[PDB]
């Protein structure tokens, strides 16, 4: 009834996330290989309960479970990605909220190894003012060197079943923020496994209940 049917809130909605890699010959013929993607551009969601997934995230100061404490609770969601690595550059990741209200967004991504943090990226995001909403861009950022050598690390493991122990203990929380007082607008638990190598990137999308 007023359970999401995508991710995002009536207040902040993720319209496009997308890590990719464009070849060196792009310039040529113009091409990229998604990594991961999710699109909300043509549109109720199941649903996880977040104490199963507590351990893959820190625990204190900003941890799930104390962020999932402070709320809203319909702001969480845990998506499953299965991730392309049959490819083979610019690395990039580009991504895009919508909004009806205008606000400055604070987006903070934390990248955790067996459920730690290792690396965190946040930037600030204006608002621009499109058809009646309100649009949040941040296009083609460089991916962080972080992960571009993860990519190539698991690239070369010889094994999907090694690559999926390897994404096992790898999650990445994504917290938006309204940058002027502090609410959560969305917060995102992300979880990796590697697709079929002949099959591209897919996702699900759950709700996080307690
Ligand atoms: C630009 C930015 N500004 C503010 C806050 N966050 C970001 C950001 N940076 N960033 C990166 O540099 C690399 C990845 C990224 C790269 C690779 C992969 C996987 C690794 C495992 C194998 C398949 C590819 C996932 C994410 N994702 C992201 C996100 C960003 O939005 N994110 C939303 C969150 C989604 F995970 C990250």
């Not at 909300?40 to 625990?59: A, G, T």
């Not at 909403?133 to 079943?161: T, W």
């Amino acid at each position: 009834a007023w359970q999401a049917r995508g991710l995002g809130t009536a207040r902040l909605q993720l319209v496009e996330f997308s890590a990719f890699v464009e070849p060196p010959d792009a310039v040529d013929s113009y091409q990229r290989h998604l990594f991961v993607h999710i699109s909300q551009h043509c549109p109720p969601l199941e649903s996880v309960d977040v104490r199963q997934i507590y351990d893959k995230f820190p625990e204190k100061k900003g941890g799930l479970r104390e962020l999932y404490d402070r709320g809203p609770p319909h702001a969480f969601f845990l998506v499953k990605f299965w991730a392309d690595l049959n490819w083979g550059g610019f690395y990039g990741v580009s991504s895009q909220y919508e909004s009806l209200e205008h606000m400055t967004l604070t987006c903070s991504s934390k990248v955790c190894s067996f459920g730690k943090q290792v690396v965190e990226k946040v930037e600030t995001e204006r608002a621009q003012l499109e058809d009646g909403r309100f649009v949040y861009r941040l296009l083609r950022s460089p991916m962080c060197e972080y992960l571009v050598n993860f990519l190539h690390k698991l690239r070369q493991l010889p094994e999907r079943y090694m690559m999926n122990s390897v994404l096992e203990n790898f999650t990445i929380l994504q917290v938006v923020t309204n940058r002027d007082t502090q609410e959560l607008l969305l917060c995102t638990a992300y979880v990796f496994e590697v697709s079929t190598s002949e099959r591209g990137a897919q996702h699900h999308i759950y709700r996080l209940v307690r």
